[PDB]
Amino acid sequence: QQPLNEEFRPEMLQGKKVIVTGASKGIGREMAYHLAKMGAHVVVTARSKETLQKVVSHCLELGAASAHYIAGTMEDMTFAEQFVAQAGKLMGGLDMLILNHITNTSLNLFHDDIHHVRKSMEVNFLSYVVLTVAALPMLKQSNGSIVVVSSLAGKVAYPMVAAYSASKFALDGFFSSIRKEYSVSRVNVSITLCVLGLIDTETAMKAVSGVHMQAAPKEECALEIIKGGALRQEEVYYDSSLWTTLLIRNPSRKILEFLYSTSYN
Amino acid sequence: QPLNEEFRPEMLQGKKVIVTGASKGIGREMAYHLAKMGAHVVVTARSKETLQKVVSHCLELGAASAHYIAGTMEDMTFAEQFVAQAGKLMGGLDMLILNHITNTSLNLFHDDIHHVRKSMEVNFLSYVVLTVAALPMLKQSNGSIVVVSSLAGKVAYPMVAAYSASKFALDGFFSSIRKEYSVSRVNVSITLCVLGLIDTETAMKAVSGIVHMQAAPKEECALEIIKGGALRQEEVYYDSSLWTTLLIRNPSRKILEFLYSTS
Ligand SMILES: NC(=O)c1ccc[n+]([C@@H]2O[C@H](COP(=O)([O-])OP(=O)(O)OC[C@H]3O[C@@H](n4cnc5c(N)ncnc54)[C@H](OP(=O)(O)O)[C@@H]3O)[C@@H](O)[C@H]2O)c1
Ligand SMILES: NC(=O)c1ccc[n+]([C@@H]2O[C@H](COP(=O)([O-])OP(=O)(O)OC[C@H]3O[C@@H](n4cnc5c(N)ncnc54)[C@H](OP(=O)(O)O)[C@@H]3O)[C@@H](O)[C@H]2O)c1
Numbered sequence: 001q002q003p004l005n006e007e008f009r010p011e012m013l014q015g016k017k018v019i020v021t022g023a024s025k026g027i028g029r030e031m032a033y034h035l036a037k038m039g040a041h042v043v044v045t046a047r048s049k050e051t052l053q054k055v056v057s058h059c060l061e062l063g064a065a066s067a068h069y070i071a072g073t074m075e076d077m078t079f080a081e082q083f084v085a086q087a088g089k090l091m092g093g094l095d096m097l098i099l100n101h102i103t104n105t106s107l108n109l110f111h112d113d114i115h116h117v118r119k120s121m122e123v124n125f126l127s128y129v130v131l132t133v134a135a136l137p138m139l140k141q142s143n144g145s146i147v148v149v150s151s152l153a154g155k156v157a158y159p160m161v162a163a164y165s166a167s168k169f170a171l172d173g174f175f176s177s178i179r180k181e182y183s184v185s186r187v188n189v190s191i192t193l194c195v196l197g198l199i200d201t202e203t204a205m206k207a208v209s210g211v212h213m214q215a216a217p218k219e220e221c222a223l224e225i226i227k228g229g230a231l232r233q234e235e236v237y238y239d240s241s242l243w244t245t246l247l248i249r250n251p252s253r254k255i256l257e258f259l260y261s262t263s264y265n
Numbered sequence: 266q267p268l269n270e271e272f273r274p275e276m277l278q279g280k281k282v283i284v285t286g287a288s289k290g291i292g293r294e295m296a297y298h299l300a301k302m303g304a305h306v307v308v309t310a311r312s313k314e315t316l317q318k319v320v321s322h323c324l325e326l327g328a329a330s331a332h333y334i335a336g337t338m339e340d341m342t343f344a345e346q347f348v349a350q351a352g353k354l355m356g357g358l359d360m361l362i363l364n365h366i367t368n369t370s371l372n373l374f375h376d377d378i379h380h381v382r383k384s385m386e387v388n389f390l391s392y393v394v395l396t397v398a399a400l401p402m403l404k405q406s407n408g409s410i411v412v413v414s415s416l417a418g419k420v421a422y423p424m425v426a427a428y429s430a431s432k433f434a435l436d437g438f439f440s441s442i443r444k445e446y447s448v449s450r451v452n453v454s455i456t457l458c459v460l461g462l463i464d465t466e467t468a469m470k471a472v473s474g475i476v477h478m479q480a481a482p483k484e485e486c487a488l489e490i491i492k493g494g495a496l497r498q499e500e501v502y503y504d505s506s507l508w509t510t511l512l513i514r515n516p517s518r519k520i521l522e523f524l525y526s527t528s
């Protein structure tokens with residue numbers, strides 16, 4: 001996967017057709033708004049239409065080349081697959097798939113909640129796979145890009161987020177493996193995994209409101225995510241701590257993977 | 266917190282161990298090793314005839330008990346029943362060795378969502394269900410949970426995406442609850458094992474074409490899993506090369522988690 005050795009330029013997204021999921025709020029909404037401000041075509045999704053409409057409206061107000069929404073739950077694999085189709089017609093193509101949404105989750109110990117674990121896998125992980133499969137043909141045409149939004153808990157272990165972490169680890173294991181597949185098959189679709197720390201979205205602020213954890217600004221975060229996709233980077237790291245930003249990489253893993261891949265064929 | 270001792274076989278003598286996917290491969294050799302130790306075993310898998318055969322050689326080997334209970338971990342109900350059924354058959358549970366996997370598909374991923382889902386269900390979700398159901402008894406003996414995983418559950422490889430997803434998920438989930446059990450003072454240890462190429466028939470069938478590094482003896486591999494589990498180690502790394510286990514360590518992650526919990 002060859003990234004561009006350029007500096008990012010906001011114009012790179014002008015006229016581009018982009019899906020963003022879980023975009024009625026949080027980092028997703030903020031991504032829609034940056035893409036809007038860049039004059040991109042944008043289709044957003046989430047379960048609730050009212051909140052989605054506001055985003056759509058302000059996107060056009062912000063200068064979006066076009067902007068729509070389709071509401072639905074990503075518990076529905078059928079909705080997921082269909083959403084990408086409807087969204088493809090709407091824009092006449094696809095340059096970028098931004099996979100962002102999660103099921104509602106809050107900090108808690110794990111006792112018996114298999115139903116939360118499975119819904120997490122289904123919504124947080126499986127639905128991302130179904131959306132990728134549904135979007136690849138269009139993405140092969142544009143030579144597009146999959147952006148997968150992940151978490152520190154998707155690279156290291158923390159208490160209170162077991163089912164969430166499982167699903168985020170899964171994303172890494174899956175998409176990191178198909179990136180290597182796309183590179184032998186010579187599929188020219190980039191895959192960017194984003195490892196975010198605590199971000200000041202309203203939901204996240206509510207879920208931790210109860211010690212001191214410094215949150216990072218959602219607007220800058222959203223842009224760092226778009227920048228990584230645009231530039232076809234493998235991983236984007238974003239946290240408020242410089243120590244965390246550093247320690248969340250895995251140089252051992254890069255070396256090993258590189259030795260294996262220039263070794264096997 | 267590991268046990269501050271050298272391993273000695275008799276630690277397992279009398280203990281109540283479940284071993285899943287124990288009809289063949291590494292699972293089978295763990296049943297056997299635990300048997301020469303004196304443990305009470307109960308194995309499980311889908312293969313009735315073969316389970317029977319192993320259970321029988323376990324009795325010949327020194328085991329204090331040997332029972333099998335065939336079924337598929339695609340079935341969460343049977344997974345839940347199985348631990349209860351096995352708990353009775355033993356009057357307690359000391360060790361839960363979680364090892365089974367669905368059949369892994371060595372190929373480019375294209376559109377088989379159902380195979381991804383099934384990998385997640387069998388390879389990961391069923392491990393959660395089994396653990397949920399074996400907890401109460403594990404708490405009472407202050408027992409151990411062993412989770413078997415792979416090079417491909419720590420780093421990424423092409424051709425095994427669904428499997429890598431499931432093994433990665435094992436790491437997140439069980440590493441997260443390990444930190445939860447420490448702070449809520451649950452005295453149940455958790456061991457994640459990371460295995461390179463082991464010479465099981467399954468593996469050798471899989472790597473037959475290409476030429477790799479020497480595969481490692483499944484009998485040694487199985488014992489090291491039991492050892493680490495017994496000593497309550499957090500992680501066991503096993504490959505025929507020490508270089509592999511050196512290269513696979515991630516000190517960054519260890520330091521970052523130390524930082525988060527001094528806090
Ligand atoms: N903020 C953080 O501290 C943080 C940290 C690490 C990683 N991240 C990652 O950043 C991404 C965005 O998180 P956020 O904090 O911005 O969350 P958020 O503000 O809570 O936004 C979640 C979005 O997902 C949608 N959603 C929820 N359930 C859905 C379902 N079943 N089907 C379809 N859409 C659903 C929501 O809309 P509806 O409810 O209307 O459906 C909403 O638009 C996530 O992947 C998260 O893991 C965030
Ligand atoms: N061998 C290696 O090179 C290697 C490398 C990395 C990781 N590992 C890990 O080591 C563990 C064991 O590997 P192995 O090579 O020993 O595998 P194996 O020889 O293929 O045995 C897998 C076991 O799982 C059982 N199983 C399959 N589907 C099942 C289902 N639906 N329900 C219940 N049981 C099922 C199989 O029994 P039945 O068909 O009789 O049901 C079999 O006993 C796995 O977790 C694997 O990830 C091995």
Ligand SMILES: C[C@H](CCC(=O)NCCC[N+](C)(C)CCCS(=O)(=O)[O-])[C@H]1CC[C@H]2[C@@H]3[C@H](O)C[C@@H]4C[C@H](O)CC[C@]4(C)[C@H]3C[C@H](O)[C@]12C
Nearest residue numbers: 259260369415416417428461462463467468471506508509
């Ligand atoms: C053999 C490879 C890994 C080899 C590797 O990654 N090595 C490359 C170079 C590493 N080194 C730098 C150490 C060597 C170079 C310097 S050195 O001098 O040391 O060679 C590993 C990685 C993924 C593994 C499969 C999965 O588990 C799924 C499945 C589980 C079953 O149960 C058994 C079958 C199967 C198909 C597994 C078989 C095997 O187990 C695989 C292929």
Ligand SMILES: C[C@@H]1CN(c2ccc([N+](=O)[O-])cc2)CCN1S(=O)(=O)c1ccc(C(C)(C)C)cc1
Nearest residue numbers: 106107151152153158159160196197198204207
């Ligand atoms: C540092 C943050 C927050 N984390 C966390 C973990 C544990 C606790 N705790 O109070 O024990 C508090 C916070 C988990 C890891 N990260 S994160 O950025 O991966 C993250 C942020 C927000 C969440 C939600 C879904 C709980 C809001 C989960 C993970």
